[PDB]
Amino acid sequence: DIRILMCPPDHYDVDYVINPWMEGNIHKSSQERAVEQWKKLHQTIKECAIVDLVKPAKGWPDMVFTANAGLVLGENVVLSRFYHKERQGEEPYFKAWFEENGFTVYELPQDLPFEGAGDALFDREGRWLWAGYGFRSELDSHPYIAKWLDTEVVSLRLIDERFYHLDTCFCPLSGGYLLYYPPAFDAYSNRVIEMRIPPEKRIIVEELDAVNFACNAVNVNDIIIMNLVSRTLKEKLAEAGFKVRETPLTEFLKAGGAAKSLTLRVTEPIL
Ligand SMILES: NC(=[NH2+])NCCC[C@H](N)C(=O)O
């Protein structure tokens, strides 16, 4: 069974600016359109996986972005500790959901930021965990995660403020494929990626797709769900065996997130 956690946009707005996509967008989201877009995404994901919901909290508009609730492996979750006070109030609500749903929760020190699956994505065969740092999660959190979850952690440094979470520019896929935007990473981190993923398994995104959040994609088996995709990228994905489903998420891009950011896979098998 594959299960994905989402959180509906009952209280969604753009109320502050903590990433560059939010600049100029305060109160520019339409709550009604956001509901419509989220409902279409929810339906599309539910066609591929079970969807669980956590009740949203008023005053925490970014709670829709459940990718940042924590990092799940098996029965364990490393709870996120947000870098910004504007999201720290989500933490007790996410903790309560994990506890109520049978997970055993690990908490980092309150001074050590780490933003969950948004910044840390497993290689889909379970060989290691790719973990971003540079804007939200601290590099020093990576050894904690490695030990708590008994996984090798491969740290990747983000260098572009637009691509401030790993999942905005990097997406492990089924079959060992990796969908990513190399310019979001420094040279050393690109070499680290390249050492592990050979060219035939790389699906390299160009900037025009990256800025439409193409890497912020939900992949269940051979299905990939995203906001918008160029024909060029759709054909590359089709050639690699994936079926692309697009669903519009413009109201969430105003807050710096798209399809993947609105999801957390809570069934991450031990392999
Ligand atoms: N996993 C993600 N890409 N999350 C996007 C979160 C967007 C939210 N406004 C923030 O700045 O934190």
UniProtKB/Swiss-Prot annotation:
Q: Where does L-arginine bind?
A: N19, N68, R87, R136, H165, D167, A255, S261
**Site: Key determinant for dihydrolase activity. Where?**
N68
Q: What happens when the gene is disrupted?
A: Deletion of the gene abolishes the growth of the mutant on arginine but does not affect its growth on nitrate. Deletion mutant exhibits higher levels of arginine and lower ornithine concentrations. The mutant shows disruption of the cyanobacterial ornithine-ammonia cycle (OAC) and severe impairments in cell growth when nitrogen availability oscillates. Arginine biosynthesis is also impaired.
What does the annotation give as the result of altering E115A?
A: Complete loss of arginine dihydrolase activity
Provide the family line: In the N-terminal section; belongs to the DDAH family. In the C-terminal section; belongs to the AgrE/ArgZ ornithine cyclodeaminase family.
Q: What is known of its domains?
A: The N-terminal domain (NTD) is responsible for arginine dihydrolase activity. The C-terminal domain (CTD) is responsible for ornithine cyclodeaminase activity.
Function, as annotated, reads: Bifunctional enzyme involved in a cyanobacterial arginine utilization pathway that enables cellular adaptation to nitrogen fluctuations. Catalyzes the hydrolysis of arginine to ornithine, with the release of ammonia and carbon dioxide. Then, probably catalyzes the conversion of ornithine to proline, with the release of ammonia. Is highly specific for arginine and cannot hydrolyze citrulline, dimethylarginine and other amino acids.
Q: Kindly provide the name given to this protein in its UniProt entry.
A: Bifunctional arginine dihydrolase/ornithine cyclodeaminase ArgZ
Traced from the root, the source organism's taxonomic lineage reads: Bacteria, Bacillati, Cyanobacteriota, Cyanophyceae, Synechococcales
Span within the full-length protein is 4 to 274 of 705
